[model samples]
Target chain A: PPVHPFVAPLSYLLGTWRGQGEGEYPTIPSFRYGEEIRFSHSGKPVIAYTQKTWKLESGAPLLAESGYFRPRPDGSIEVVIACSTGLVEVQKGTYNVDEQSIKLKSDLVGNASKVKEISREFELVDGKLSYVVRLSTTTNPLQPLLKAILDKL
Target chain B: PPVHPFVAPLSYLLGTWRGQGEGEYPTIPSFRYGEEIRFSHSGKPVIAYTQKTWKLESGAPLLAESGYFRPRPDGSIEVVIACSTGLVEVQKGTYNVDEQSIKLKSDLVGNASKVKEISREFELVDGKLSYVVRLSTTTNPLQPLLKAILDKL
Candidate 1:
């Protein structure tokens, strides 16, 4: 089956991506990690997203998250994500058709988690998929949390 | 890497399961569908899960969901699931080692959805996996929603 017309706008994100990322938070020391991200579809209107990260030095697994990306007819987007650590997040955002970019902000964050909110920015530029994450926690307001650039494989 | 020790208790649910399912609800006519479910681990304590279903007659996609399974120390379990239809669910349940079965009930259902609650029963008998779902919606109380028997492939 052909890719659903609704998700064609997200075509740039449909693939396996691997790279390195840096993370920092006010309560924790900065560190680097290896990451892999995947966006897939079964010719459905929604895109399935998964992500995994590991410590760069010890190769120990860090966080893993999975979710779905729903593209609305009005050009808005909705996402539901759950992390391995019992954290769940729901986000709403918008995409730019010509720029191949998106901006998202949290609509709901897991009550059991320290995170109060999350924001994300993703862009496809010069064949590189790059994104930045900002997180708000009980201890701190929204601030840069992690960022990475990946090459599609 | 070997499977994480924490997820061994859920080993029975690992791998791919495929079969046909029947669905019924007060709002829709009874129908048949095909389903495929998968559980996987990346040497992590959490098990990643995904399910996809399609109409039996037209082979059209019906629903798809993705989430994580977390096994607790006390034999309790936590799951966070998000469907492609913009619905998210967080569930808590229990697994009995002796029976190799599980029962789950929704802790949170998407606010935008009509579903009020969900309950699931899964059992493995004679090497076959079977499960039934009951859902409470805005217009109806809990009742049978879907059921299926699947074989590991």
Candidate 2:
């Protein structure tokens, strides 16, 4: 079947977006992390795509990776995230058109322990980004991770 | 607003369909007549109907009428027909999913024009192309005038 013409303009985001970000653990002053995140889009009618990253903060190099995003007919989006810390997470959420972002809340097992997290952010300018990542196991308050700049090279 | 699923099946016909046909004139001596017919869909998100009939044999209209066919978003159907010759006709109808038949009755009419038309055989076999026509004019025989098959592309 031919694709509806109305969905053609959304093809602009149909490629790889590469960017960098920095993170800090308020309690661990010695650990400042730099990371590269790649957002890619595969040409599918349902708009399926994946994300992969490398973190300088983690000396072991393998950080976090997520399965391709799947779009449902009912307008919901689903993604599966897996981390090197023996964690497997299924994040389900709806795309917030007004906020120009995706908000996800998930229940998962990380480091052989149960955890829940809510992640939300928008694409920022100047190659700099901001995000809120809250984990149930974290002792520190939900601090803002900011001023992370990314270069699409 | 929620999108109705039943209307999805008929979206293929959301456009203007114009065509000409050749058929034997019932009153005249089996002459070929040219027909200029127009079918359209409108802003109501439902079928808004109007039809004009002309004699291709002599360029004179043997009959013309206008009525409403409310194809409910729930897969039910209702139809009304009024003739130019001082006759008004109406039919309450339903569709038979098992036999692909649309059962309708000419239950009422305005004034002295009393003509009832019942069409039980109707199907969207090709999706965009289906045929169900039953009309009677003052000087013409009550019969099927034409059968058409159309597609958007």
**Residue B94 deviation, candidate 1, in Å?**
0.8
CAPRI band of model 2?
incorrect
Q: In model 2, where do residues sit more than 4 Å from their true spots?
A: A1-13, A45-62, A73-75, A109-114, A120-132, A138-147, B1-153
**Top candidate when judged by lDDT against the true structure:** 1
Local distance difference test, per candidate? 0.84, 0.43
lDDT of 1 by residue, B40-66 (tens): 887777888888899887888889878
DockQ for every prediction shown: 0.62, 0.01
The DockQ score of candidate 1 comes to: 0.62
Q: List where candidate 1 sits over 4 angstroms from the true fold.
A: none
How does model 1 fare in lDDT?
0.84
| Candidate 1 residue-wise lDDT, A1-153, digit = tens | 667888897887988999988988877888799999999888878888889999887788888888888886678988888877877778889988779888899888764666788998878877888879998877888999999999998
TM-score of chain A, model 1?
A: 0.93
**Top model number, TM-score:** 1
Candidate 2 lDDT, tens digit per residue, A49-100? 3333455644323343333344454546554443322233445666543344
- DockQ class, candidate 1: medium
